Amino acid sequence: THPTFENSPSGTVLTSPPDGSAVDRATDAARRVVDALLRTDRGNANLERVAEELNSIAGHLEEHAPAVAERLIDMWNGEGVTRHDPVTGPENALAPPVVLEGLSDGSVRGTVTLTIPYQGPPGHVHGGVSALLLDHVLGVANAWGGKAGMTAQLSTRYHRPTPLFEPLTLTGKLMSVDGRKITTAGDIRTADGQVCVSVEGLFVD
């Protein structure tokens, strides 16, 4: 059922495709609000009414629950790539979101340009955000490699500053399997190819 490097063409989009909704347009607008709040003038007296508006909007959203809830994909249990997660979730305003494709050699790849909510050192991506993105990519690389495992250990190494506001290439690949034990590796590079962050993860199942 789930797409893997053996049953799907190279370039198969693994994350959720744009559908033109609706809720995705609203989530994009929320992401835009999140960005703007970090840049806005904090002395703006209008922020009082803006908070009322945002709270009003949230109240509306809360009062409109879906009649039939969509299932949550447990990717780490072999159910396919997740759609609700804080890295790639289209309806998750925490997610950039990252778009990922599976390639013929077993690797998974995407490019993301990150913005100020993701900031740690001035002008650069928080080292923890780099870890979050890489963790998720390894999960997707495992799905695409036809394997499933619970995260056991992540070892992240930081080589060069990771900048905001420019294209970062995320890549992951399942490297080996020994029984229940899966080893997966990935990195984040700038457009010139230089590695900023790399990771080795160990998984079980």
- Smallest distance from the beta carbon of 98 to a copy of itself, in angstroms? 11
Q: Show the site string, 27-46: x = touches a copy of itself by CB under 8 A, - = not.
A: xxxx-xxxxxxxxxxxxxxx
Selected range binding a copy of itself among 2-10, 26-34, 102-110, 163-171, rule: CB under 8 A: 26-34
Q: How far is the CB of 10 from a copy of itself (least distance, A)?
A: 26
The verdict on 129 binding a copy of itself (CB under 8 A) reads yes
Residue from 7, 10, 21, 104 that binds a copy of itself (CB under 8 A)? 21
| Residues 64-103 within binding reach of a copy of itself (CB under 8 A) | 64-67, 69-70, 72, 74-77, 82, 84-87, 89, 91-94
Q: What b-and-e string marks burial along 134-167, b requiring 16 or more CB atoms within 10 Å of the CB? A: bbbbbbbbbbbbbbbbebeeeebeeeeebbbeee
How many other CB atoms are there within 10 angstroms of residue 122's CB atom?
6
Task: Give yes or no for residue 17 binding a copy of itself (CB under 8 A).
Answer: no
- Considering beta carbons, is residue 28 or 101 the nearer one to a copy of itself? 28
Least Cα distance to 168 among 144, 143, 187 occurs for: 187
Residue 163 as a binder of a copy of itself (CB under 8 A): the answer is no
Task: List Cβ neighbours of 170 (8 Å cut-off, separation of 6 or more).
Answer: 98, 100, 109, 110, 111, 112, 133, 134, 137, 186, 187, 188
Which residues touch 189 (CB under 8 Å, ≥6 apart)? 168, 169, 171, 195, 196
Residue 136 found at the interface with a copy of itself (CB under 8 A): yes
Q: Does 181 bind a copy of itself (CB under 8 A)?
A: no
The CA distance from 205 to 5, in Å, is 19
When asked if residue 25 is in the footprint of a copy of itself (CB under 8 A), the reply is yes
